[PDB]
Amino acid sequence: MKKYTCTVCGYIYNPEDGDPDNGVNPGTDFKDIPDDWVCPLCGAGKDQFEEVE
Amino acid sequence: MKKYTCTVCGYIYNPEDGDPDNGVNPGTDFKDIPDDWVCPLCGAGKDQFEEVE
Amino acid sequence: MKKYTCTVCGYIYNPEDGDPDNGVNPGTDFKDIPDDWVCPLCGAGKDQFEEVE
């Protein structure tokens, strides 16, 4: 699975880690995260993220 | 022609339906969509899409 | 690289120009701007910016 970065603050969503404290379990692909989830560090929406590659 | 999904919001581009409101007619293969077209639901570019399955 | 717009005042961050007098050199992608940088016209943080197309 691909990592994604928050364009507003640079937070990296790592699929292996997930974001469990906000209900995104380890191993969740970014496309499968609920579309109301926001960046844990700056509150930016998913639409402000892009693939690392 | 295969379906493609926006990995940022989960939108599925289906070639049989196209995206006629933004000038992408039914029968347009994903690679042939004008490269300035974005995801109708979250504004992500074609570079954030992935072939389904 | 994508241009970003300040939703508070309309200032456009252009990656090719950067914002050199506030330490952001030409060629800096918005996601790589240090997170304490603000819009030079209105003081808005990076969180008030949105990608243009």
Ligand SMILES: [Fe+3]
């Ligand atoms: Fe963020």
Ligand SMILES: [Fe+3]
């Ligand atoms: Fe999308």
Ligand SMILES: [Fe+3]
């Ligand atoms: Fe501003």
